[PDB]
C-alpha cells in the first residue's frame, strides 16, 4: 500500500477548480476554473507561478502538449485556447463547436488536439493552423472525454449517451463501440499506458477497465462516489501500480490495479475531489476539489 501525505495546500481560484494537470516535464501544475482561468503551480513545493486569461466563460479541462510548452484549453465559451506557457500569450483560439467544450487532449506528437463537447461531437484540430480538420459525428449526447493513445494512431470517446467509442485517428472512422446493458452515462475514459486496454468511469458509482480489443471488461473498482460529477481518473505508474480518483465524499480513493481492493483514502479536502492528476516521475499526486473547499492539495507516497 502507499502511505500519500499531504505535503502543501493550494488556494487562488474563486470559483470551482475543474481540472488539474502535471506536465510531461514533470515541473509544473496546471490548474482549471470555472473563473475562466488557468493557474500554473510548481510541481514540487506548489508555489505560484502565473495566471493565464482570456476565455469568456469558465474552463472544463486544460492539457499540455509533449514539450510541456504549450497548454490547451477547453471552455464554456465554445472556444479551445493553445496558450504558450512561458508568456501566457493566446497563440491560436479553435472556433467550431456550437455549444460548451467539455474536455480536450494533445496527440503525443503534439501536431493535433481532440476535443469533445457538450454539441455532441469530437474534433480534431491542427495545432499550428488552428484549423479543423475533421468534425466526428461521435455522440448523441455532450461527450465527456477524448484521449489518444500513446501512439497517436487511436482516440477514444466517452459520454453521457452510455458510449465508449475508439476512432482512426487519421481516418476518423469509429473502430469499437463500447456498450453496457444499463447504459450509465460514461463520464470518464481514457487509454491505459501500454495502449492495450481504457479505463472508464460511470456515474454510478464504478470505474471499468476494458481490453476495447475484446470488448471484455477484466476490472472493476467500486467504493468511491460518483454519481454527478465528471471526475477523471488516472493510473499512476511510478510506484505501486494504482489507479487514482477523486470522489463525491470529498476523498480520494487509491486501489489495487490488479487486486481492485481499496489501498489508501486521502482525507482533508471539505468538498468533492473533482480532480485528481499523478506526477510523471515521482510518488505525487495533487487533488483538487470544489466551490466550498477552494484547494488544490499535493501529496507524496514513498511508493
Ligand atoms: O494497465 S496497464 O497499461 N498494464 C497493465 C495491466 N495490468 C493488469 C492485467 C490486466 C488488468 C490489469 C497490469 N499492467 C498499466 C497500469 C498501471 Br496503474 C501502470 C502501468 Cl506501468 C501499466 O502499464
Known sequence: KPNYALKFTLAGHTKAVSSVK????????????????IKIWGAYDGK??????????????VAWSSDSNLLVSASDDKTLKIWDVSSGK???????????????????????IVSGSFDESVRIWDVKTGKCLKTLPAHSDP????????????????????????????????????????????????????????????????????????????????????EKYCIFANFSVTG?????????????????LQTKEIVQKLQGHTDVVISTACHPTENIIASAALENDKTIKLWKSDC
Open 22 to 37: 502535471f506536465s510531461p516535464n514533470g515541473e509544473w501544475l496546471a490548474s482549471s476554473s470555472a473563473d475562466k482561468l
Open 48 to 61: 505560484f507561478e502565473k495566471t493565464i486569461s482570456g476565455h469568456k466563460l469558465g474552463i472544463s479541462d
Open 90 to 112: 493566446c497563440l491560436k483560439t479553435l472556433k467550431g463547436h456550437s455549444n460548451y467544450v467539455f474536455c480536450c487532449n494533445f496527440n503525443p506528437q503534439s501536431n493535433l
Open 143 to 226: 461527450v465527456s472525454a477524448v484521449h489518444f493513445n500513446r501512439d497517436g494512431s487511436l482516440i477514444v470517446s466517452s459520454s453521457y449517451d452510455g458510449l465508449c467509442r475508439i476512432w482512426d485517428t487519421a481516418s476518423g472512422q469509429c473502430l469499437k463501440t463500447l456498450i453496457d446493458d444499463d447504459n450509465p452515462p460514461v463520464s470518464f475514459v481514457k487509454f491505459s499506458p501500454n495502449g492495450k486496454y481504457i479505463l472508464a468511469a460511470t456515474l454510478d458509482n464504478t470505474l471499468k477497465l476494458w481490453d476495447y480489443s475484446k470488448g471484455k471488461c477484466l476490472k472493476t473498482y467500486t467504493g468511491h462516489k460518483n
Open 240 to 256: 505501486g501500480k494504482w489507479i487514482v480518483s477523486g470522489s463525491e465524499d470529498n476523498l480520494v480513493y487509491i486501489w489495487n
